[PDB]
């Protein structure tokens, strides 16, 4: 909103046109526009109007039911010993996201790789969680 908005012209113009064009044709639903980012950035007003990008949709984090479904999708793809309880593992992981439950499956397999197993037991997954997934990992029990 500063006087560096001068330099950043090319970006004001691409956006403006795409919006001007959507409201131009707002009654007809043919084209959808979706923009994606980690987090909301400074922009020109456009969240105030049906024909622009009206809707502002939040992603929260998963919960126990959600982690467990995500684990059942994971467990089709790869072998398991068919004993693994998503609900129980889900209690054992705190503040995990979907991508991170997928990295536990990889680490569970890295235990398995060392062990000489081709499947994973419950233990194999528990140990996988202990190792890094790089954004959050439940393993805390240190303090004397």
């Amino acid at each position: 909103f500063d006087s560096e908005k001068s330099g950043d012209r090319e970006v004001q113009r691409t956006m403006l046109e795409l919006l001007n064009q959507l409201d131009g044709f707002s009654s007809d639903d043919r084209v959808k526009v979706l923009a994606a980012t980690n987090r909301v950035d400074v922009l020109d007003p456009a969240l105030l109007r049906s024909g622009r990008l009206d809707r502002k949709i939040e992603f929260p984090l998963p919960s126990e039911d959600s982690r467990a479904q995500i684990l059942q999708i994971h467990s089709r793809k790869m072998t398991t010993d068919d004993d693994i309880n998503w609900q129980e593992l889900a209690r054992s992981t705190d503040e995990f996201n979907g991508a991170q439950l997928k990295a536990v499956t990889v680490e569970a397999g890295m235990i398995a790789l060392r062990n000489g197993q081709s499947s994973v037991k419950h233990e194999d997954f528990v140990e996988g969680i202990s190792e890094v997934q790089a954004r959050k990992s439940k393993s805390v029990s240190f303090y004397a």
Partner: protein, 233 residues
């Protein structure tokens, strides 16, 4: 940025509360697993004691505040002591002034206020320690959860420390059964040990890690310490 709102304890941030406060809630999980459970006539506290070495001797995770009261800590030690002295002081005065033992509820609400004051003070800090405080007053058996930002909840059962969610699943099932056993100490106690070993998944249980404390209608603050916890597994 992180570094912008972190430096002193006097700022709110768009999140609704300060970053530092969340880091105090996080520390509790680092420290020792302690489960809390009650029926309606007695209330039981089970705690895992950890040390650092073979040639180290245990640090006590139960600190007895009265002959009808005690608490468990989980998290930062130095604050857990500064708090247990305050609770001692609060208790005694009640007895000296009002002839009163000090209710769990009554204590919780005084402790909360102390916690707001140390989170508006800029040099001051969150304590960084959560506590499970148990008692039997003339309000009945009690378990309270104290958090170091002033959050106080009365519960049937709960856990703080290593995989709290872990123990909580166990307790929530076996709940309806054990809590209607009212007048048998031993059962509720036995459910406590059965629970705590299933929260564990990168530790194991043993006799001299475990320590149990019970308070109730006919049990004055008594610890089973070392050997004597074997007969509750």
């Amino acid at each position: 940025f992180r570094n912008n709102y972190d430096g002193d304890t006097v700022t709110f941030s768009p999140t609704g509360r300060l970053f530092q406060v969340e880091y105090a809630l996080e520390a509790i999980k680092q420290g020792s697993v302690t489960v809390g459970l009650r029926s309606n006539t007695h209330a039981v506290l089970v705690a895992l004691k950890r040390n650092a070495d073979e040639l180290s001797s245990y640090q006590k995770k139960i600190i007895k505040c009265d002959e009808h009261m005690g608490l468990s800590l989980a998290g930062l030690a130095p604050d857990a002591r500064v708090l247990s002295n305050y609770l001692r002081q609060q208790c005694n005065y009640s007895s000296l002034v009002f002839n009163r033992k000090l209710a769990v509820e009554r204590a919780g609400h005084l402790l909360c206020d102390k916690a707001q004051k140390n989170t508006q003070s800029y040099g001051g800090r969150p304590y960084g320690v959560g506590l499970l405080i148990i008692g039997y007053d003339k309000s009945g058996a009690h378990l309270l959860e104290f958090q170091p930002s002033g959050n106080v909840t009365e519960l049937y059962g709960t856990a703080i420390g290593a995989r709290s969610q872990g123990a909580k699943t166990y307790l929530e099932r076996t709940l309806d059964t054990f809590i209607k056993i009212d007048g048998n100490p031993d059962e509720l106690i036995k459910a406590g040990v059965e629970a705590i070993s299933q929260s564990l998944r990168d530790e194991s249980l043993t006799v001299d890690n475990l320590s149990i404390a019970i308070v109730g209608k006919d049990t004055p603050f008594t610890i089973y310490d070392g050997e004597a916890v074997a007969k509750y597994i």
